Design a protein around this ligand. Structure first.
Ligand SMILES: [Zn+2]
Ligand SMILES: [Zn+2]
Length: 258
């Protein structure tokens, strides 16, 4: 029972191998806009992706992922609620079997069509190994996708998906600019949480953007062509690869905007 998203190995089963799944600071959560309170002390987010160097794109059996060279301070995230500078290591997506669902975070219980996660680690903790042991060792920038006009910045990604259809396939993926994946506003919500996949470590400062990016139906249709399965294995279409909202428990969600 390697983990997945189906009836027999999905999010309801994860706690058996990773008991932190019933922990105190699990993600995603629902963001209720009545209770997510504006914090005037929150600094604007600093996203510097201009020197990002992408390495590869891969189907890992739970999503598709684009990886980055994190050997030095090129593509970094800082400011906002964050201490120190955070290096981008990868991004991936979550999406649904139809446009009406797919995002992991929700806003006033509304599910978006997809959710993009840009994963960064805190350099003040030396390496990724020591970072994930710390409550703010990772920062994940979360961005909602809604269906509308095409995002030109997403095109180079979706157009190579046919080359990584099944679990375990990968391809060289150089000179991709993650700047093209961002909405206009960097207005955000932030709270302390976890990885939304095993091992579910409670090491993430979540930064979820208020403004969704719009992507075309054509584009999101390319997401749904991916497989959970390996090459030549019976088809398990990669859709609904999202963990549902987990209990907020004691936590406060802060808004950077009024
Ligand atoms: Zn994996
Ligand atoms: Zn994710």
């Amino acid at each position: 029972h390697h983990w997945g998203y189906g009836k027999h190995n999905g999010p309801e089963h994860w706690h058996k191998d990773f008991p932190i799944a019933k922990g105190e600071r699990q993600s995603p959560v629902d963001i209720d806009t009545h209770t997510a309170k504006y914090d005037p002390s929150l600094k604007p987010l600093s996203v510097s992706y201009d020197q990002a160097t992408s390495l590869r794109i891969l189907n890992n059996g739970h999503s598709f992922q684009v990886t980055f060279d994190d050997s030095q301070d090129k593509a970094v995230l800082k400011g906002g609620p964050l201490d120190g500078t955070y290096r981008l290591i990868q991004f991936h997506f979550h999406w649904g079997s139809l446009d009406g669902q797919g995002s992991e975070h929700t806003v006033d219980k509304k599910k978006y069509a997809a959710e993009l996660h840009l994963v960064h680690w805190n350099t003040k903790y030396g390496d990724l190994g020591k970072a994930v042991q710390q409550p703010d060792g990772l920062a994940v920038l979360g961005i909602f996708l809604k269906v509308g006009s095409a995002k030109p910045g997403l095109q180079k990604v979706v157009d190579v998906l046919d080359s990584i259809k099944t679990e375990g396939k990968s391809a060289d993926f150089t000179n991709f600019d993650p700047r093209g994946l961002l909405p206009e506003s960097l207005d955000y919500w932030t709270y302390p949480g976890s990885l939304t996949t095993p091992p579910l470590l409670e090491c993430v400062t979540w930064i979820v953007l208020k403004e969704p990016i719009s992507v075309s139906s054509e584009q999101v249709l390319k997401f749904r062509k991916l497989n959970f399965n390996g090459e030549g294995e019976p088809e398990e279409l990669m859709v609904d690869n999202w963990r549902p909202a987990q209990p907020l428990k004691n936590r406060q969600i802060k808004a950077s905007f009024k």
